């Protein structure tokens, strides 16, 4: 059957599970793996493009008793693209070596130190943590072990499925696929909440409104909840910094994507004269990108002048000393749209 | 011109070629070079104005 | 700055590049039309104001294929000419929008159990400057759309 | 680089060069149309969802021939004027697409047992600049196509 | 005769008796990418005491397939006209032993189709020239390319003649690719043409009036095995 | 130092070949590539523009009349119904000496559609010139 000798049609009565292939470009996650995994050991990193490639590399049947494969199955079911596998101890040394990586996913591991070292301003990385494995304390002290960081988010609780036998799927694996799907459909400026969880993955513990109330401020945990009329949904889009800026995941992710795209846009100006024409060309490219982003609906305002501004030139962003050193400095401002989180219904009888 | 030799012998060779795109090979090679060099944004800046082209080897 | 991948992902598809499969073989065609799904509407009215509207029975599919006349080609007329009383060979028709080279499929229309009912020969005109074109009309069971 | 033989083998045939044979005689014509095959459709619906569709009875052929008026020529009107009650002489009609010189046949349309039903005379208009044209309509049994 | 550069293909005949179960019936054939063997012999209603060799019908099948689908399409999975019946039935297990190395192509009968050709392999089991369509297409391309550039004889052995020859060869290759013979989404992925000094010809070659051109092509290979995997969980 | 300047090729340094023979022409024009534009508009402001179908090529070649020279009229006159011999046209820009090719225009499957005879004028001292128009499939430019 597997060995093909004669031309024709072969019939087999056994069939391993297959999954569809989804493609994305603004969300490429890195999965942290345990050190005892034989697939990752011996290599710095491995690129996985789909579920079939992972199964081929593993050279074994699917095992619900392992965490990496169930995490990858949850990630690919929810609509994820290609990803990278990196051992936890080598995260700090290997993650910066990859250019297309935009997300860090803790597939059931501890990545606090790696997140603290890597998720820093200007580096364009976002981390997805996992909540406590047990029930949340009623006093709201279950988030005290997380370092406050506008580049990280936490999701609770863990997930179970029909194929799950003795372990639980970490919520980050499905959340990465949800991020990929939402970015593909609505864009990176749309909140990755109020969206279903594919594959019939059920929350392990039910979270009520009162319970979520204690965990939606300060270091906020985003909750996976089930609803009678909708099913399993993501009910949180907040980062770990309760600030007027970077409170919401969409704003931080949109700004990171804009920074990366703008940096890529003007990279053509290297080894060019550090004079006015080069600055004009860079301004033209940046303005074109920003106008396209605004026309897509990413930014706010009725006209582009209300959405963004760009400054570049002598006595504005660069000095004579800066020019003599061959440094080009550009300043960009943007306006983002914030989601509606609370809807209040006031009922009366006077009509 | 005084020594323009006429064409008298004609020889042609037809060989097999892989179904590949030259731009794909160039991009893959430049990505491999960037990864090997370190993958830092400084490396990406240093490779902005570097052109890599490949040609089939008839040997 | 838009790359061809962005066009292949987000731009709408034109309607002039397609491939047609009739039965187990592929035949080039000039025009395909009539791939419509129609439902009847059943209405019930009450004396207090209730107005119920629900879908009714599904209707059959009628499609037409236009093709030029080629030397030694009689396949479509041979198919329509094999009818004996109510017996005829029913074939499945698939129409797919392809890329420029035809090496990829973008969207597919599937037509089940189609048999011919009418054949139109070219009209011979001594003043025209057109290619002889034949037409065939088919009746089928159902049509479904499958994306790549 | 395409040779004329390649064009004769693979290219589609135009529709302006043809020859028409009526009975045992060949008559030049300006326009021939109506060579269509039509079948009725019989349907039967079950109470459990079965929907049977099969071909029905074949329909008759109705063709029209167009030709200019020539001096001393009244053959078509003589044919239509020979009807006595239900008695008329029926003839077979063959329309063939030829090459440029008419020395070769590319495809043939065969019409069996055709008799006239209507005859249209030219309309006399003092302001027109056209050739007087007569029309004749025939009803026949069946039409078949033979490839050379 | 069937040697590289000559553009000839041979159609052999299989053994007149039943195939041995150990697969040693093909040991009397020299391995050659320019030849193919067909088994078994054929019978017909008009046949009385002898059997029609399979090669005679296979040549007509080759002609018909080339006329209809082109030389790049496998001359298999096609019916045998005239009601010619195989003399011996060949099972899947029997064909399994004879579809590798020096391969014999089988004429088989199927309940839903009838008598069909069920093999398109040459006598060389190599990544190149494994299939009849690729070898025959390359032979046809070589012959056509040689014919196309024959107009350049007794012309100056300089750049303009090479440019004209390159133009003609490129036109032929583009027509072949557009017909669907070659693979690739664009002509650059399908073929390349090289001709000129320091690329294909040297000064000594030019002084002898020798014109050398190099052409690469990409061919589409057929699907030979189809695997159906059935499950119940749905 | 040593700024290098290059000037465009003069327009009269070209060589034309029809089929496999080189014919001395006087003027070649019409080698243009044209694409239609397909537009789709959405209610929210999306305006998609993409290339459409490529159009066929129309080429006119102009040359004088010489004694015992009717190859072009023999080509156009050999038409029988829809059958005609299609040839490939190649126009190349050469160097000053005419021994090297710089740029090449490739035309595939061209057949005649119209022939224009000289306008006989008894009051003119000019040369009698004939013209032919061809319809082709595709034009391609190759840099040598």
UniProtKB/TrEMBL annotation, chain B:
Organism the protein comes from: Photorhabdus laumondii subsp. laumondii
Protein name: DUF4255 domain-containing protein
UniProtKB/TrEMBL annotation, chains C, D:
Residues making up the signal peptide according to the UniProt record: none
UniProt cross-references to InterPro entries, sorted A to Z: CHP02241, Phage_T4_Gp19
GO molecular function, one term: structural molecule activity
Source superkingdom: Bacteria
Name of the protein this chain belongs to: Phage tail protein
Source organism: Photorhabdus laumondii subsp. laumondii
Lineage: Bacteria, Pseudomonadati, Pseudomonadota, Gammaproteobacteria, Enterobacterales
Automatic annotation (TrEMBL), chain E:
Leader peptide range in chain numbering: none
Taxonomic superkingdom: Bacteria
Residue ranges of every copy of the Tail sheath protein C-terminal domain listed in the record: 124-231
Sequence similarity: Belongs to the myoviridae tail sheath protein family.
Protein name: Phage tail sheath family protein
Organism whose genome encodes this protein: Photorhabdus laumondii subsp. laumondii
Origin organism lineage: Bacteria, Pseudomonadati, Pseudomonadota, Gammaproteobacteria, Enterobacterales
Residue range from the parent sequence: 119 to 352 of 354
